[PDB]
Amino acid sequence: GHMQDLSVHLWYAGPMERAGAESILANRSDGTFLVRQRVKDAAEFAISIKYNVEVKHIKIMTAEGLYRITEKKAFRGLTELVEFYQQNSLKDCFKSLDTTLQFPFKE
């Protein structure tokens, strides 16, 4: 939008909050995922995914202008991270998360 407005991504809940993220996800099926931001203090990011009637919210690291759900990875853009994992289990990046980007919470 104005720049890196990830909000354009169906899985981007943008201003949504964690508890809020869980609200939809909690109601959605396992695998349901999304991303959100609202801490107008730290330009950080985190992905939220539905797992076993529960939601997994993992924070994304930022340093080299790269995005990673784990201190061991790095992507150039959420969309390249999220949409790329659609075919790569999150457990490969996530710590406990054992699934893939099944569907966005916005769906």
Partner: peptide, 13 residues
């Protein structure tokens, strides 16, 4: 509301 994503898990050195 005033909550967010704490940190499910992280990997140390």
């Amino acid at each position: 509301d005033t909550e967010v994503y704490e940190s499910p898990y992280a990997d140390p050195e």
